[PDB]
Amino acid sequence: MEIEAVEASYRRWAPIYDRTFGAVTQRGRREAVARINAIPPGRDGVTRVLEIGVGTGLALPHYAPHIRVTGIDASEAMLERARAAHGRRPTVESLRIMDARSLDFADESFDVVAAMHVLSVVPEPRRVMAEIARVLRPGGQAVTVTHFAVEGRGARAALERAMAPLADRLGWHSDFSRAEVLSEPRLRPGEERRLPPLRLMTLLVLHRI
Numbered sequence: 001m002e003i004e005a006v007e008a009s010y011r012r013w014a015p016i017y018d019r020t021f022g023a024v025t026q027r028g029r030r031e032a033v034a035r036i037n038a039i040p041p042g043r044d045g046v047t048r049v050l051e052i053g054v055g056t057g058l059a060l061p062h063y064a065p066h067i068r069v070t071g072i073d074a075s076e077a078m079l080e081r082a083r084a085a086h087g088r089r090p091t092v093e094s095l096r097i098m099d100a101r102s103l104d105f106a107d108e109s110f111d112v113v114a115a116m117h118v119l120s121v122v123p124e125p126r127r128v129m130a131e132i133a134r135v136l137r138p139g140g141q142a143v144t145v146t147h148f149a150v151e152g153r154g155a156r157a158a159l160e161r162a163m164a165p166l167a168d169r170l171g172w173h174s175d176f177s178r179a180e181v182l183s184e185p186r187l188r189p190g191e192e193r194r195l196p197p198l199r200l201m202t203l204l205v206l207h208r209i
């Protein structure tokens with residue numbers, strides 16, 4: 001989505017987000033955070049995490065004490081909820097407005113990127129995936145959770161196709177495909193699980209080569 005359309009959509013979402021979309025995606029969110037928590041600590045016994053599209057910060061309270069998490073988002077409305085609820089937590093290093101297409105962080109500066117329900121929203125996902133590879137240290141990981149549209153005939157595929165023109169009203173691309181997370185050759189796809197709701201979501205871990 002164009003960035004201004006992201007802002008407009010998530011201004012509307014923010015007051016209901018946690019009790020609606022956020023609530024039905026909590027299991028996958030917890031699972032993603034559990035994976036991140038389990039990764040062997042980086043330097044000084046800390047795991048430095050970049051939360052791309054941190055939103056209202058529903059993942060934040062689940063990060064273990066050894067995590068240092070930096071969250072970025074495009075939406076003030078969403079981010080202010082993350083601030084209000086979680087801004088004082090010791091694991092939370094900062095919460096900033098930043099566009100994932102252009103990350104103001106050094107090459108190889110993070111151990112982990114978290115990208116939950118965001119890659120199907122961003123403008124120019126090709127640019128985002130390149131930035132993810134750039135900021136990840138060798139052997140680092142991106143833990144992603146996204147809906148991918150299904151291939152072929154049938155009712156799900158048809159509804160995904162019908163919702164594609166509605167992106168700016170909905171807040172995401174319903175036709176988002178797996179290929180759009182795999183455009184960057186420095187990121188090798190590993191663990192893949194289908195998660196609720198209704199088997200719509202894919203957890204996909206990407207390893208920095």
Ligand SMILES: CCCCCCCC/C=C\CCCCCCCC(=O)OC[C@H](COP(=O)(O)OCCN(C)C)OC(=O)CCCCCCC/C=C\CCCCCCCC
Nearest residue numbers: 020021117118120145146147156159160171172174198200
């Ligand atoms: C309100 C939209 C209507 C959804 C249609 C119903 C589909 C369920 C039925 C059958 C399954 C097969 C058809 C699938 C068809 C495709 C569904 C789809 O686009 O999926 C992906 C989508 C987003 O995921 P992302 O890209 O990872 O995230 C990025 C964006 N995020 C951060 C918001 O996820 C969902 O659609 C989860 C389910 C909807 C659950 C949302 C909870 C309801 C939301 C708000 C409450 C208001 C409801 C009123 C609207 C109902 C009238 C239609």
Ligand SMILES: Nc1ncnc2c1ncn2[C@@H]1O[C@H](CSCC[C@H](N)C(=O)O)[C@@H](O)[C@H]1O
Nearest residue numbers: 053054055073074075078099100116117122
């Ligand atoms: N280019 C971009 N840069 C930063 N944040 C972006 C972005 N495009 C979309 N987003 C953010 O992506 C979020 C999607 S909602 C998902 C929020 C959170 N990860 C969760 O699991 O609940 C929104 O808050 C939106 O503002």
